[PDB]
Every structure is written in structure tokens, then in C-alpha cells.
Design a protein around this ligand. Structure first.
Ligand SMILES: Nc1ncnc2c1ncn2[C@@H]1O[C@H](COP(=O)(O)OP(=O)(O)OP(=O)(O)O)[C@@H](O)[C@H]1O
Lengths: 78, 372, 97, 993
């Protein structure tokens, strides 16, 4: 999102928000609304596993802001 | 450029106004500071010719040059960053949470002895520092001096102040009508007197001290001509019921600070050498003959006897005297003066027409006022 | 105008006024000095004296305040009254000197 | 699992406490006890626990029992919401009638009956105006819709919701009965503005800004369009009206519901902390927090079987007010929501003790705790010392539901992001900055060329064919057709003006991008746009306004066409002011905003674009004389007479080819005069046309938000009725016209003056300080007198000069007078005319009345028995004091009385005693005048110096005398007051300190 590539990303995001991108119709809404009322896949084999310790899975986490430069998403600056 | 200033300083709510300037707070984005930014235009809304614009630009560049000359002084205001655009001036300074000396003085009417002592000490320090660099401010006014959270006074308005050289004198006529020396009026009569000098700042300090102590400017009249004649004549007087309860050192300092003759006026170094600003911590060279010890013992006994009489010399309420004259009681006079000032505290701003001495009328409003 | 000897005498008097060096004459030290001299001022009278001598209500006396108080002018009648009172206090014995 | 057991226990507790009174068929829960009545707010707050339990149960999916329980809870919530929606649609007539002319008799009833969804009470036996309940219902409906639940279900229901939004958006300028449904402290059938109401309404409008009620499957035809100007006005009102509760209450515990989890409608976290601290200091008790100071609800006195309590609450209801644990639940919610953990633990520990057990050991939250009648004096002498007893609704559904929700939040079974999917938790995050974009368009080729040779590149009106530019009236008429349903007798949004925040955004209709100019550039509506200095000044003002808040997503865009009216006399170059403004903005800085010049197509790439789906498909002798007369002022005069006698709408028959009515001739004359720029008959034309300044009601409510009183016209005793509450535009215009009477131009001058006052209040809220009431008539008299003094002319010449001055001159003169800058007699007259008094004057007068039997002002009397009835912080006491002091019609005498009162207060501070009699300030000032005359005679002043007032008997030198000094009037007033005190003392003085 830095440098001269800032504009194409905004154009693609606006195309996604409009409703149709690349000849394909898409819908934009909150994740919680989309999840509710939808079919969910069940993976019950993990519970049946006899492993003493359940494996730990690392999920995507929010990246904390830096405390040295504090780049608060400045302009494109070509 | 302007883009760098915009990305570096964030305009905020207005903190002050001028003849053609607006003062607003700014925040230094890399540092999250609380500095102040001053915005002054060039064309004045298209109301003046480009000659006025170029004169204003020259004044601003002279101001920033003089300020950068004296940069680094903690007592003097500092110019952190300067910017120049086609139609706007951007300057960065240090913001203070306290107002100017005018606001504090009009709130407190009269300040304490320690406060006035430290204020004149700081003013003497800054003026002697300026003299060391051959700079004349000649615009020392109570409104033009500010304060901070530490009750420290910092001189500002350096747009007026310019560099000087030995052997040359200036001739411009200006300033507050009550803040002029006999030198300026002598020069401006027709052509006789050479020009400006150094003692203008000394009389500025004197009138500052007089205004802070007595609560009113030493010279004030309903007519411009009368007040300029009184200032030129140098016929100032000390109030009878106001200056009685003060130490003699302040009378002497004010008297030598208001001397009409520039040659006889005390220098800043001479003022600093006075015992009023002199302080002592500890010494071990106080040795003399037994005659000195006897004199010290006698003086100590005299001082003890003097303080032994302070409580018995106090006066009672004396309600009858209050009926005849409410000015006899100093606390009552101070209270009524403070109440009167609080009633009319919204008519004290810049301008010779209305000032603190307007509120006070010591002269009797009788047939004698007709004579002039 | 003052003198160096006068300044030294005032400093010595200020130092001797308080038993402990703290820059203040202190109400307790002044009361003890008064009792030692042979006087018993009232608490209200002492508080009134402290308030009158001081320029505000802080309730403490500094050396510049003492110097300013000693700088007052008694004129003529007050001076002779003061010296007569001092002589009477000093002349406790019935000798006339 | 342990979590499953805890959830089962919580569900059992909820079923046994709240859900046991589900009341099928309708689904509206009874409001506890033997009431058999349903409150919409109570039901909405009670359903929160059920909604939270359902949300928690939904997470533990993949099981039939858990899925069934979650579905049952969600369907119960949906059924309750649908029952409330049916209840509210049952008063479509009331909603539509309230949409025009806001009155307490037109709003829907707050009290709704049980099953069969009928009305249980009449329209006059209860307070049927509570915008807070409807607004919180809308906000919670939006929250549930965003969560995933389907509640709003029909296009007719969507239109009804839009009508409800239009009904609620006017909350910032109307007075309701509040949450307590009792108005101020004394009921007396009165209502007043409440901060909670406007805050919750603003939060509701923010929640429904662009929400899709049909969910992910919804289309463009099922979205709400909510304007941002009203929300910003509400925010400003709240910011200027949240150092206390309201204009009458110093503090209310209901203010927590604005600065906490419910609706999160507050910014400036420092103000939130200050409000919480003051609420804790003034309301916290041993069994919760009291509702507000001086409340008599549930008291052992005051005849509980009575209403409209008389003003006798001096000390009866003081220090013995009841305490409600629901505010403790609100505090624990606030602690557990944002970032607090220790506060949650301490508040839970405190609340666990005040809990009362029920059947089978069930927790129950009592409604309030009341002081026993026997131990009343002990509580009065020793506050918060006696022990209260539980009484009221033992199973308080609101408090129990709030406590259950808080406990579920604290236990970790639920997250803050579930109840608030609309991310309202970060409303206190500071806004970094905003960049505003502006565009300049030339009407004609000549303007474009004139801009070109001056180094500015613009685009003409043409060549931008994909983009169309019209004034704001078209946008207004377009929005007036929003939410219109002929079958349901819905008239849609009424025609209202829009601020600069509405025209800034871009609009897309019929697949075409539309840009609208700001509403202020319409010279047809009013003559204010004619002045160039006015244009640039309030353009800077609106730029600053846009740069300040900009709460709406996207970048803004401003269009500034350069018309033909601001050109110079020769008509060949632009004026200095507009050229300077363009040059300043070109440097990326104008006023207090950062701007950048550019092309509209460039701004189209990134801006705020909105799509409007709803727009998809002898008389003859007089006429001859008027035609032939010169002296255009006399021509307008004759036109006014013709309009007065027989020209309301009758054709004058001036022309033969075409019949033009009187209005056409008036418009032609106004257009002709606008070119010459002569302000001699412009006011007359404006008065004849009855043109009114736009957003006058907005200015009035902004002025009244600071606890100020306004009076219209010169004051006689009978007329000039004061205004204390916000008033509709039609009634305000009627009052202005009635005050102006036949002077017509007086109304226009008054309009200009109050609009200037409103403009100056926002920019500099320090000049109007210490002022309690503002009188336009007195101000007009003062400016006329000042101009006459300056010009040394007559009153008629002064009025003519005032009429001839430009609006910028009016603003400059008003600013100079307000500052009070430019002898002592004139200054005293100006001070008295504007009734300027010190800030602590009210407190000093209250203390004097406490320490004295009364005050005599040479007429009537002011008893000291009123000090117990009122408080120094109450505006009623201040207005009573002002009315008492307003009897004397001499401003100099008023100032003399003020300073006499001040010196009397200083004396009463000096002397510790009770006067025990009535003191006359008139006698005091007379004694002071006599003493001054005697002193002047002794000094040597002759007869011409010792003058006498023609109608006051006061020496002119007294008015000319300075306040302080050796011979100032302060000393004489003090001497006179002391002499009066000695005259009213037992032959001695009692002044000691
Ligand atoms: N750091 C600051 N914070 C707030 N206000 C300030 C600060 N520095 C200066 N000011 C104010 O801005 C003004 C500075 O003087 P300026 O030259 O802009 O005004 P002026 O009308 O030309 O005349 P003067 O020099 O007499 O003030 C004063 O009104 C002063 O109170």
C-alpha cells in the first residue's frame, strides 16, 4: 500500500465495493453477518484422536503498531 | 515548503489575535509536542498595495533574523522553526499555559514584593543581555510580556527590535503614548535632537515597575497633549495613601529609573548591583574589633525593641473612622479596589484611551478641574 | 543608604533570633525568647503581630521582612519613647544606670 | 463441561425471572407488580439479557439441544421486537401528525397495554412524549439487525422506520418529559430538554446511518438514509449541555446511560471521567445511587396519592432520597466494557450485599431503598448513616436484566464485540485530521478568462456534462420525497434546509453524478450573500466547521462557482477579498483547514458518494404615478402602499402585452436594486416579501443551549414575552412578526442581529459571558444612540444611517459594542442597558438575602423567605433577581443599584451580625448623592458643577466619577451603606473581624 502502488489497490477495492469486478458479481458486508445463517463444516475427528496433548494452531493476529518510527500510514509520496 | 509545515504542524483552536495575525496551537507529529504556530498574511485581503506587502515581508525577515541572533536564551522566547510561503508566514514558538502580564496584573491588581522583585530581576537580565548584543527593543509594555507555569517572564514581539551600530540614532516616532522619553519628543520637535538612544528602555523598565507597584501608569490624562506635556516635563509624583507602606529601596530604584536626563539614568549593570537584587547565603569574613560587636549588639537590641512595639501599635477596627473615611483602613481600601476592578474588569485591553489609571480618579472633581 | 556593618549586624541579629537555623524566626522561637526576656504575650496578640508584620497570610517571617521592619522611621517622639522603654527594661535594678 | 453447566444455570435463572412473563400472542412483558402495562423502554432493556444468552448459546453449536435453545431465545427476541413494532405502527396517525408542528399532544403514547395491543390511557392523563425510548428501541433494532437477527421485514415497515427517524431527528430542539416522565424536579405539567434524550437519539441516527435491515440478502431499496447535519447539531448541543444534567437539574444519574455501554454517545473521554466523578460524588450511597437531587418519589410524606407537587421541597426531600442499584449495574457494565477489571470486582462485591434473595434462593434486584419514617431526622443530621429498607418492584426486570448481562460479560462467556457489532466502543478515539477538497467553476467564458490571466486555472459550467451542478433547493425537494407512502398516508420527510455537511457529499441519481453548491450562495433567499466580506468570512466559518467534525466516511468536496455579482464596478476583474481567498486556498491553507485545488473528475476517484434508490422510475392614476416616478426609494414606498391597500396579489396592470402580478414587480425591483448595491430600500423589500433567515430555529436553539433568555423588540410591560424553550419555525416567525408590529424592517434587523449573535456565540463564547438575558430592542436602541452620538445627528438620521450600513458594518458595530470599546456616564449607560453583572453577583445577592430580611428598591419588596425555596445555581432565582432589579428603567440607576448591592455584600462580609430589617438601596444612593453634593459645596464647586438629574435627582458628576479612587463613588456608597446600617442598629456598631 506504500509508494506508487497505492492507487491501483484503491481502484481494485472500489471495484470490489461497487459489486462487480472482472465480470463477477460480489457482495461486501460484515464478516459476522456472513458467517451467521451459513452452512458450517464439521471436523469431529480431532476430538476422537487419542493424543494426550491437543495440538496448538496459530491463528492470524493483529500486528501492533511500531514504537520506534510510528508510521501512521502516511500519504503515497511517489 | 507549505506541505512540510502542514504535515509537521497541526492547526488548532485560536489562542490569540493581533492587528494582522492569528495565534493558534500546533502539535509536532513526530514528537507530540504542544508548540504554537503564528499565521500572518501578506496582502491583507487585497486591501493594500504590494509596497505594504514587501514592507511586511522585510519586517518579518528582520524579526526572524534578530530572534535567531538571540536564540538559545532560556528567558528569551525561542524560534524553533520558521517557514515562508507566497501568501502566508508560518512560525513556530514555545506555547505557555499562562496569559500575558496584562491579564495576571488585572486579575491580581497589585503583585507581591517577591513577585515584583523577581520580575524586575528577570527583565534587567534580559535587557542587559540584549545590550550586550547591541539590540534595542524600545517596546517594553505590560501587555507585551507573557508568563508561564513557573511564573517566569519571557519578552516577545521582536518584530520591532532591530540591530544597531555605535554612532547611529533612529528617528521614528511610535509606541504607546505613555512610554516615550524626552529624547523622542526632542528629536521630533522639528529636527533638533539627533535621534534614539539607550535610556528609552530604562524609562520603560521604570514605568513597568511603577505600573506593577502602584497599580496604575505614572502618567495618564484625558487629553493627549496634557499627558505628553506631563511626560516631557517629568513631573511625576508618588501617591500619598499608596506608596506609604513600602520600603525606601523601591522608591529610590523607581526614582533613578524615571530620571529625565539620559546621562543620569542608572545603567542595567548599576541596577543589578543594587542591594535590592543582592542576596547572601553564608559568609565567614564578618570579623572586626569589639567596637563592631558592640555596635551589632546595640542594633540587635534596637531591632528587638522595635519589633516589641509592633503588636501594641496595631489599630482597632475603628468603625467611626470607616464612617468618616474608608480609605484609612488599608485592607478595606484593597478590598473595595478589588471589587471595583472585578465589576469593571472587561474594559482593560490594548490602547492608551482606556487603561488602569482611567478607573482611578485621585484628583477632586471640583471647579479646580476647569483650570488647565 | 545602608552600610556593610549594618548588614552584618542585621544578619547576626537574624541568626541569633532563632535557636535553630532555618531562615524563619518561627512563632515558637519568638515565644521562647519573649519568655526568657521576661514577657508573656498572649497567643492572640502574637498571632496578630505575626499577621501585621507579614505582608500576607503565610505566617512566616523572613530576613528581608525583618530588614524592612527595621528600616522604618520612628520620627522623634517614637524614638525617645523607644529609648526610654529600653533604658527602663535594662535598668531593672534600683541604681539609675 | 463446566461452561455448559454455568450456561444452563444462567438460562434457568433467566427463564425463572424474566421469561416467565413472556405474555404470548403479543410478546410484550408486563412491567412487574400488578400493573398490567407494558413500557417499551423497560421491555427493550429486559430483552437484553435474553439476547445475550442467545448469542452465548449460539457459539456452542453442532448440538440439537443447544441449537434449539439458541433458536428459541432468538425467536423470543424477534417476537418481542415484532410486538413492539406492531404497537408502534398502531399510531401511524400520531407519528405523521407529530412530523409537522412538534407538540406533546401529537406523539405516540409511551405507555402501551398488554395483549390485543391497544391504548391503556388517554392523551392527557400521562406524558406521551419520550423520544429516548423510541430512539433506544431503534438503536437496539439496528444492533440486532447487524448481529444477524431478522426483525424489520417489510417495505412498509421500512417506510415506517424512515418516518420514525424523521420524527426523532428533531430531538435537539424539543422538550420532553425525560426518562422519569416528570420533566424537571417539580412536575407542574412542564417539560424540558434532557441530555439523555438527545444523546440516545444521536446514537440511534448513527446506528441507522446506512444499515441494511434485510441482511446480506437486502438490496438498495431497503436502506435508511440519515443526514449528518442533525447528528452534528445534537453532538454540539450535548457538548455545550453536558457539565450538568439539564437546565434545571444540577446532576442526574441517568447521564451514565450516555457515557457508558448503552449507545456510547459521547466523546472527549476527559468529560466522561469528569461526569462519572461528579455523579459518584453527588449521588453515591450505601445502597446504590440516587436518581437526582431533590426528588420526592417513594417518600414517607408528600401525600403519595397526589400529583403535581407544590413548590414546598425546600428541605422535605433533601438528604433522604432513595437509591437505585440499576446505576450500580450501569457502573459495572462500564467497568467491564472498556478496560477496567478491579472496578468490576469492587462494584460486584458492593452490589452482592444489597441483593435480596427470592424463591428457591433466586437473586432479585429491588427497585429502590427507602428511609424509614421514624429515622428521618437522624439521616438529615447525619447523611448516609441510617439503614433503609427494600420496597417497590421486587423483581425489577430492567435491573435484573442489566445485572445478568453484566455478570455474563464478566464471566467471559460473552465478548464486547458481540453485543456491539457496530464498533461503537471506539467512539472516544481521537480523530487525527481531515483534508477538504474544493472546486472552482466559472459560470461564463468571461469569468474563466478573467480567472486565467490572474494565474488561476478553472473549468467552466459546461464541458463537465457527466457532472451537473444545481443549488441546494433541488436537493431539498428531492429529499422531501423520501419515505413517501400514499397508502399509509405518509408525507415523507418535510422540507428542511441542509447544512454544509450535506451538500459536501456527492450524490448519484439515475446513474448520474450530481454535485450541489452550498446553500449559502443563494442571493435569492436573502441579501446576506451580496456582501463579499460576509461571503469570505462565513465561507471560512463553514470550512472550519467541515474540517472540525467530519464524522462521515470518505473525503468531502466543495464547489464554489464564481457568479457575476462580486465583480468590481467596471465588471472586468474580481474583487480583492475573493481573489485573496482563492490565492490563500491555492497555498493549501484557508482559515483553520487544509485544502487542495483540483478538478471535479479527479475528486470523483475518492469522495463520499451516495446512491438514492428511491428516485428510480384611482388605481390607474396610482399605477401611472408609480411607473413615472423617480427617486427609487419613493418608488418602493409607493409599491409598499399599493401592496398595503389593494395589492396583496392583484395585478397592477402596469404592462399591456403581459399581465404581471405585484410579486413579479417586487422581484424585478429587488434584482435591479441588487445591481446598484444601495442599502436604502433592500430592508423594505425584504420586509414586504416576508423573507426569513434560513435556520433561524437552529440559531435560537444554539443560543438557548447556554442557559440564555431572549426578548423580542423594545420592552414595554405588557408585550415582549420572553422565550425560555425551543420553539418551531412557524411560531418563532409569528412571534417575531408580532413583536415587530408595523415596523416590518424591525423584524429584519432583529433577524440579522440574532443570526450574528448565534454566529459569534460559537466562534467566541466569551463575549456573551456574564450575560443572562439578551434584548434585541434594547440593543437596537443602543446602536441607534451610539451612531447618533458618533454622527451628532438626530434619531431619524441615525435610523437612516443604520439602515444604509452594509451587513458587514452591522457585524463590526455589534462586535465593537459587545467588546465595549471605542465618558464615564456613557460607559455606565451602556453597561446598564446590556445589564452586565459580575459572575458572582447572584451568589452575593443570595448571601445578602440570607443575611438580611429583604431589600427595598423604592417599590415592591424582595422577601428573604425565597432563599430556602431556590438555590444559587438555579436559573429561577437569577431571573427573579433580574426581574426585581429591572423595575427601574434607568441603566445608570441600575448600575448604581448593582454597585450599592456589591458594597453592601462586602460590608456584610466584614460585619458578622444580622441586620434584621429591610434596607432600601434607593435611600442609600440618595444619601451618597447628598454626601457628594455636600462635599462638592465644601470644596468650592459652583452651581453649574452641582447639576441635578431631570428625572433622577443625581448629580452628573456622580455618573462621570470614576469607580475607584480617593473621591470615587465606591467610597461614597460605602459611607452611605454604613450610615444606613448605623441608622438601623441599636445605637452602636457590630462590625468586627
Ligand atoms: N505562545 C503564545 N500563546 C498564546 N498567545 C500568544 C503567544 N505568543 C503570543 N501570543 C499573543 O499573540 C499576540 C502577539 O503579538 P502580535 O504582534 O501578534 O500582536 P499585535 O496586535 O501586532 O501587537 P502586540 O505586539 O502589541 O501584541 C498577543 O496578543 C499575545 O498575547
Amino acid at each position: 500500500i506504500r509508494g506508487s502502488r497505492f492507487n491501483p489497490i484503491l481502484d481494485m477495492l472500489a471495484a470490489l465495493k461497487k459489486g462487480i469486478i472482472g465480470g463477477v458479481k460480489v457482495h461486501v458486508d460484515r464478516l459476522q453477518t456472513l458467517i451467521s445463517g451459513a452452512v458450517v463444516e464439521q471436523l469431529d475427528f480431532l476430538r476422537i484422536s487419542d493424543t494426550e496433548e491437543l495440538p496448538e494452531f496459530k491463528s492470524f493476529e493483529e500486528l501492533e503498531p511500531p514504537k520506534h518510527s510510528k508510521v501512521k500510514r502516511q500519504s503515497s509520496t511517489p | 515548503s507549505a506541505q512540510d509545515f502542514y504535515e509537521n504542524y497541526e492547526p488548532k483552536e485560536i489562542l490569540g489575535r493581533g492587528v494582522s495575525s492569528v495565534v493558534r496551537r500546533c502539535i509536532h507529529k513526530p514528537t507530540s509536542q504542544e508548540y504554537a504556530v503564528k499565521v500572518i498574511d501578506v496582502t491583507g485581503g487585497g486591501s493594500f498595495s504590494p509596497e505594504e506587502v514587501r514592507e511586511l515581508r522585510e519586517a518579518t525577515l528582520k524579526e526572524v533574523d534578530i530572534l535567531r541572533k538571540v536564540s538559545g536564551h532560556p528567558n528569551i522566547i525561542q524560534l524553533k522553526d520558521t517557514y515562508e510561503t507566497n501568501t502566508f508566514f508560518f512560525l513556530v514558538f514555545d506555547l505557555m499555559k499562562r496569559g500575558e502580564l496584562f491579564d495576571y496584573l488585572t486579575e491580581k491588581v497589585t503583585l507581591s514584593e517577591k513577585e515584583t522583585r523577581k520580575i524586575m530581576r528577570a527583565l534587567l537580565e534580559v535587557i542587559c543581555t540584549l545590550h550586550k548584543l547591541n539590540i534595542v527593543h524600545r517596546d517594553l509594555k505590560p501587555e507585551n510580556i507573557l508568563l508561564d507555569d513557573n511564573m517566569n517572564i519571557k519578552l516577545t514581539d521582536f518584530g520591532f527590535s532591530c540591530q544597531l551600530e555605535p554612532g547611529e540614532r533612529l528617528r521614528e516616532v511610535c509606541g504607546t503614548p505613555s512610554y516615550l522619553a524626552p529624547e523622542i519628543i526632542e528629536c521630533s520637535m522639528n529636527e533638533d535632537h539627533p535621534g534614539y538612544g539607550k535610556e528609552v528602555d530604562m524609562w520603560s523598565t521604570g514605568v513597568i515597575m511603577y505600573t506593577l507597584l502602584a497599580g496604575s501608569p505614572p502618567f495618564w490624562h484625558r487629553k493627549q497633549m496634557l499627558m505628553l506635556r506631563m511626560i516631557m516635563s517629568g513631573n511625576y509624583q508618588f501617591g500619598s495613601p499608596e506608596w506609604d507602606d513600602y520600603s525606601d529601596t523601591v522608591k529610590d530604584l523607581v526614582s533613578r529609573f524615571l530620571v529625565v536626563q539620559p546621562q543620569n539614568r542608572y545603567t542595567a549593570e548599576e541596577a543589578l548591583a543594587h542591594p535590592f537584587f543582592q542576596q547572601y547565603l553564608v559568609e565567614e569574613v564578618r570579623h572586626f574589633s569589639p567596637r563592631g560587636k558592640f555596635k551589632v549588639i546595640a542594633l540587635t537590641v534596637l531591632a528587638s525593641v522595635r519589633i516589641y512595639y509592633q503588636y501594641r501599635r496595631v489599630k482597632p477596627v475603628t468603625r467611626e473612622i470607616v464612617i468618616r473615611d474608608p480609605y484609612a483602613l488599608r485592607p478595606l481600601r484593597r478590598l473595595i479596589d478589588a471589587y471595583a476592578f472585578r465589576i469593571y474588569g472587561h474594559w482593560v485591553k490594548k490602547g492608551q484611551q482606556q487603561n488602569r489609571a482611567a478607573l482611578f480618579e485621585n484628583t477632586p472633581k471640583a471647579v479646580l478641574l476647569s483650570l488647565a | 543608604q545602608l552600610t556593610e556593618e549594618q548588614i552584618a549586624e542585621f544578619k547576626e541579629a537574624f541568626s541569633l533570633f532563632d535557636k535553630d537555623g532555618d531562615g524563619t524566626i518561627t512563632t515558637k522561637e519568638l515565644g521562647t525568647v519573649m519568655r526568657s526576656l521576661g514577657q508573656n504575650p498572649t497567643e492572640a496578640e502574637l498571632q496578630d503581630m505575626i499577621n501585621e508584620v507579614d505582608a500576607d497570610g503565610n505566617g512566616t517571617i523572613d530576613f528581608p521582612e525583618f530588614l524592612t521592619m527595621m528600616a522604618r522611621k520612628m520620627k522623634d517622639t517614637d524614638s525617645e519613647e523607644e529609648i526610654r522603654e529600653a533604658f527602663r527594661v535594662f535598668d531593672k535594678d534600683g541604681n539609675g544606670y | 463441561s463446566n461452561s455448559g453447566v454455568r450456561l444452563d444455570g444462567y438460562a434457568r435463572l433467566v427463564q425463572q425471572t424474566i421469561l416467565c412473563h413472556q405474555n404470548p400472542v403479543t410478546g410484550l412483558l408486563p412491567a412487574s407488580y400488578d400493573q398490567k402495562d407494558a413500557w417499551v423502554r423497560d421491555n427493550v432493556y429486559s430483552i437484553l439479557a435474553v439476547w445475550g444468552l442467545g448469542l452465548a448459546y449460539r457459539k456452542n453449536a453442532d448440538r440439537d439441544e443447544d441449537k434449539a435453545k439458541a433458536y428459541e431465545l432468538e425467536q423470543s427476541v424477534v417476537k418481542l421486537m415484532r410486538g413492539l413494532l406492531h404497537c408502534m405502527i398502531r399510531q401511524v396517525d400520531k407519528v405523521e401528525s407529530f412530523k409537522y408542528s412538534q407538540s406533546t399532544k401529537d406523539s405516540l403514547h409511551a405507555k402501551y397495554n398488554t395483549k390485543t395491543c391497544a391504548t391503556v390511557v388517554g392523551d392527557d392523563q400521562w406524558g406521551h412524549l419520550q423520544l429516548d425510548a423510541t430512539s433506544v428501541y431503534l438503536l437496539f433494532l439496528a444492533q440486532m439487525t447487524a448481529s444477524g437477527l431478522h426483525i424489520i421485514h417489510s417495505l412498509d415497515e421500512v417506510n415506517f422506520i424512515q418516518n420514525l427517524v424523521f420524527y426523532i431527528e428533531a430531538a435537539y430542539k424539543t422538550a420532553d418529559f425525560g426518562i422519569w416522565e416528570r420533566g424537571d424536579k417539580t412536575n407542574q405539567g412542564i417539560s424540558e430538554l434532557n441530555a439523555s434524550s438527545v444523546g440516545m437519539a444521536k446514537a440511534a441516527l448513527e446506528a441507522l446511518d446506512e444499515l441494511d435491515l434485510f441482511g446480506v440478502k437486502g438490496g438498495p431499496q431497503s436502506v435508511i438514509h440519515v443526514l449528518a447535519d442533525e447528528v452534528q447539531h445534537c453532538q454540539s448541543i450535548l457538548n455545550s449541555l453536558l457539565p450538568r444534567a439539564s437546565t434545571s437539574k444540577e446532576v442526574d444519574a441517568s447521564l451514565l446511560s450516555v457515557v457508558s455501554f448503552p449507545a456510547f454517545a459521547v466523546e472527549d473521554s476527559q468529560l466522561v471521567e469528569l461526569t462519572k466523578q461528579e455523579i459518584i460524588t453527588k449521588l453515591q450511597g450505601r445502597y446504590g445511587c440516587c436518581r437526582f437531587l431533590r426528588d420526592g418519589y417513594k417518600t414517607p410524606k408528600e401525600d403519595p396519592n397526589r400529583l403535581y407537587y407544590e413548590p414546598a421541597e425546600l428541605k422535605l426531600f433533601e438528604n433522604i432520597e432513595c437509591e437505585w442499584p440499576l446505576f450500580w449495574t450501569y457502573f459495572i457494565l462500564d467497568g467491564v466494557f472498556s478496560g477496567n477489571a478491579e472496578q468490576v470486582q469492587e462494584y460486584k462485591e458492593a452490589l452482592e450485599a444489597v441483593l435480596i434473595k427470592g424463591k428457591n434462593g433466586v437473586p432479585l434486584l429491588p427497585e429502590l431503598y427507602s428511609v424509614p419514617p421514624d429515622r428521618v431526622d437522624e439521616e438529615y443530621q447525619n447523611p448516609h448513616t441510617v439503614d433503609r429498607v427494600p420496597m417497590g418492584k421486587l423483581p425489577h426486570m430492567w435491573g435484573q436484566s442489566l445485572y445478568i448481562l453484566g455478570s455474563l460479560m464478566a464471566e467471559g462467556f460473552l465478548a464486547p464485540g458481540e453485543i456491539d457489532p457496530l464498533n461503537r466502543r471506539f467512539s472516544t478515539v481521537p480523530k487525527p485530521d481531515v483534508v477538504v477538497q474544493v472546486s472552482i467553476l466559472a459560470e461564463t467564458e468571461e469569468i474563466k478568462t478573467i480567472l486565467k490571466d490572474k494565474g488561476i486555472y478553472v473549468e467552466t459550467i459546461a464541458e463537465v456534462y457527466p457532472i451537473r451542478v444545481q443549488p441546494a433547493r433541488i436537493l431539498s425537494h428531492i429529499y422531501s420525497s423520501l419515505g413517501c407512502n400514499n397508502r399509509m398516508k405518509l408525507s415523507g420527510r418535510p422540507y428542511r434546509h441542509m447544512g454544509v455537511l450535506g451538500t459536501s457529499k456527492l450524490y448519484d441519481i439515475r446513474k448520474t453524478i450530481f454535485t450541489f453548491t452550498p446553500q449559502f450562495i443563494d442571493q435569492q433567499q436573502f441579501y446576506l450573500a451580496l456582501d463579499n466580506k460576509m461571503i469570505v468570512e462565513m465561507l471560512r466559518t463553514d470550512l472550519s466547521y467541515l474540517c472540525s467534525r467530519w464524522r462521515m466516511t470518505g473525503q468531502p468536496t466543495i464547489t464554489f462557482p464564481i457568479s457575476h455579482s462580486m465583480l468590481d464596478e467596471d465588471g472586468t476583474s474580481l474583487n480583492s477579498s475573493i481573489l485573496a481567498a482563492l490565492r490563500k486556498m491555492q497555498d493549501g491553507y484557508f482559515g483553520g483547514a487544509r485544502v487542495q485545488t483540483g478538478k471535479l473528475s479527479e475528486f470523483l476517484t475518492t469522495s463520499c458518494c451516495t446512491h438514492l434508490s428511491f428516485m428510480d422510475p384611482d388605481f390607474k392614476a396610482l399605477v401611472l404615478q408609480l411607473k413615472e416616478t423617480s427617486s427609487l426609494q419613493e418608488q418602493a414606498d409607493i409599491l409598499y402602499m399599493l401592496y398595503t391597500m389593494k395589492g396583496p396579489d392583484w395585478n397592477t396592470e402596469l404592462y399591456n402585452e403581459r399581465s404581471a402580478t405585484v410579486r413579479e414587480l417586487l422581484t424585478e425591483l429587488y434584482g435591479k436594486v441588487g445591481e446598484i448595491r444601495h442599502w436604502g430600500l433592500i430592508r423594505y423589500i425584504s420586509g414586504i416579501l416576508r423573507k426569513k433567515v434560513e435556520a433561524l430555529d437552529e440559531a435560537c436553539t444554539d443560543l438557548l443551549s447556554h442557559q440564555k433568555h431572549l426578548t423580542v423588540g423594545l420592552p414595554p410591560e405588557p408585550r415582549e414575552k420572553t422565550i425560555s424553550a425551543p420553539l418551531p419555525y412557524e411560531a418563532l416567525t409569528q412571534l417575531i412578526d408580532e413583536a415587530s408590529e408595523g415596523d416590518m424592517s424591525i423584524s429584519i434587523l432583529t433577524q440579522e442581529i440574532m443570526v450574528y449573535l448565534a454566529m459569534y456565540m460559537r466562534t467566541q463564547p466569551g463575549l456573551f459571558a456574564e450575560m443572562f438575558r439578551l434584548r434585541i430592542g434594547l440593543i437596537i436602541q443602543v446602536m441607534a444612540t451610539e451612531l447618533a452620538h458618533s454622527l451628532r445627528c438626530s434619531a431619524e438620521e441615525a435610523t437612516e444611517g443604520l439602515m444604509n450600513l452594509s451587513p458587514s458594518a452591522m457585524k463590526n458595530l455589534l462586535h465593537h459594542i459587545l467588546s465595549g470599546k471605542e465618558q464615564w456616564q456613557r460607559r455606565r449607560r451602556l453597561d446598564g442597558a446590556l445589564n452586565r453583572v459580575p459572575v458572582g453577583f447572584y451568589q452575593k445577592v443570595w448571601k445578602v438575602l440570607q443575611k438580611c430580611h429583604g431589600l427595598s428598591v423604592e417599590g415592591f419588596v424582595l422577601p428573604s423567605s425565597t432563599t430556602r425555596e431556590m438555590t444559587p445555581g438555579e436559573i429561577k432565582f437569577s431571573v427573579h433577581v433580574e426581574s426585581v432589579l429591572n423595575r427601574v428603567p434607568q441603566p445608570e440607576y441600575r448600575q448604581l443599584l448593582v454597585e450599592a448591592i456589591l458594597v453592601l455584600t462586602m460590608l456584610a462580609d466584614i460585619e458578622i451580625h444580622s441586620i434584621g430589617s429591610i434596607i432600601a438601596v434607593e435611600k442609600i444612593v440618595h444619601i451618597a448623592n447628598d454626601l457628594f453634593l455636600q462635599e462638592q459645596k465644601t470644596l468650592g464647586a459652583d452651581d453649574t458643577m452641582l447639576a441635578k438629574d431631570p428625572a433622577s435627582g443625581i448629580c452628573t458628576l456622580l455618573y462621570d466619577s470614576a469607580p475607584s479612587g480617593r473621591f470615587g463613588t465606591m467610597t461614597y456608597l460605602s459611607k452611605a451603606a454604613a450610615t444606613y446600617v448605623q441608622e438601623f442598629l441599636p445605637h452602636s456598631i457590630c462590625a468586627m473581624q
